Design a protein around this ligand. Structure first.
Ligand SMILES: CCCOC[C@@H]1C[C@H]2O[C@@H]1[C@H](C(=O)O)[C@@H]2C(=O)O
Ligand SMILES: [Mn+2]
Ligand SMILES: [Mn+2]
Length: 312
């Protein structure tokens, strides 16, 4: 009976510590508490712009993480290496929290819980895996149905629809899960105006932000993924200039080193799922930014042990 409980229906730091320990021990958060986090976080997210704009004063830092894919024990490792989230220790998790990994429910409810506890200092951006098509195929819909009910998954889907699509730091660093656009002339204004509470279209700004990848050569190509595009160093350069930006931070691609600096330093990939699917053997990384110095400082980390549940 000693499960983690909300206090007056609200998330507290005490609750989060209890939750993370509960999840470490492979136990289930009660459906009614899961429900409350989901409805409350939907309210919080629905009030946000499609483009979150964050001001980082001279002394403040922020941590940017890439894909986590239900690798809950590696998530806790991030917090042990880099400290728990707080108003003095803000985080951005750049999409793809669920699917692939076997602890997606644990990752996402932990992330939502911290979103509720620190709404102004804990940021969640939508990934391509925070969608129906992907969830149906790649594990999350199954996991929710196994641990809770079909109805619970519908609520998760409707919550994902309210996740912002991009974040801009000090008007200079733009963060999105996928990347830049299939068409020329897209601006920050276009992004702000995206009605995001939906499943992504097959093409468009919303699709691109979740799906596109950088390529080494100039111009654009059809995506190997079958949706969106591959964009070259020249595409990046122009977009940044037209929008008065310094560089972009994206995720969406595994790197053996857990990060990649491409397009002449203008396109940065960060990936936070080490030894992805227990198979890839890749390192992962998180990024430190300061605002007195918006240049990314990379921190590589390796996978930690987890209980014997196979991917998917
Ligand atoms: C094309 C290969 C690039 O790496 C693929 C990675 C493995 C997972 O995370 C990314 C990729 C993505 O973000 O879409 C994969 C996935 O989420 O299915
Ligand atoms: Mn992705
Ligand atoms: Mn991914």
């Amino acid at each position: 009976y000693s499960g983690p409980k909300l206090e007056d229906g609200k998330v507290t730091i005490s609750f989060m510590k209890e939750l993370m320990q509960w999840y470490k021990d492979q136990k289930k958060l009660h459906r009614k508490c899961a429900y409350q986090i989901l409805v409350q976080v939907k309210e919080v997210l629905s009030k946000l712009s499609t483009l979150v704009e964050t001001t980082l004063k001279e002394t403040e830092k922020i941590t940017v993480c890439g894909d986590t894919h239900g690798q809950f024990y590696d998530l806790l490792n991030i917090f042990e290496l880099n400290g728990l989230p707080s108003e003095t220790n803000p985080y951005i998790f750049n999409g793809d929290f669920v699917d692939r990994g076997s602890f997606s429910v644990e990752v996402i409810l932990t992330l939502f819980g911290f979103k509720l506890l620190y709404p102004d200092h804990f940021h969640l951006l939508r990934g391509n895996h925070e969608t129906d098509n992907m969830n149906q195929i790649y594990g999350f819909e199954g996991e929710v149905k196994a641990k809770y009910t079909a109805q619970m998954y519908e609520l998760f889907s409707e919550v994902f629809e309210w996740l912002p699509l991009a974040q801009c730091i000090n008007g200079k660093v733009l963060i999105m899960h996928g990347g830049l656009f299939s068409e020329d002339g897209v601006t920050l204004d276009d992004i702000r105006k995206i009605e995001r509470n939906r499943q992504p279209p097959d093409s468009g700004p919303m699709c691109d932000l979740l799906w596109s990848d950088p390529q080494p050569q100039n111009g654009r190509s059809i995506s190997k993924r079958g949706v969106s595009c591959q964009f070259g160093p020249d595409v990046t350069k122009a977009f940044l200039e037209e929008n008065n930006l310094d560089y972009i931070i994206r995720s969406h691609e595994v790197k053996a080193e857990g990060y990649e600096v491409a397009h002449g330093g203008r396109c940065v990939t960060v990936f936070s799922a080490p030894n992805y699917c227990d198979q890839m053997g890749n390192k992962a990384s998180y990024i430190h930014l300061q605002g007195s110095d918006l240049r990314p400082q990379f921190h590589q980390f390796t996978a930690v042990p987890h209980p014997n549940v196979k991917p998917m």
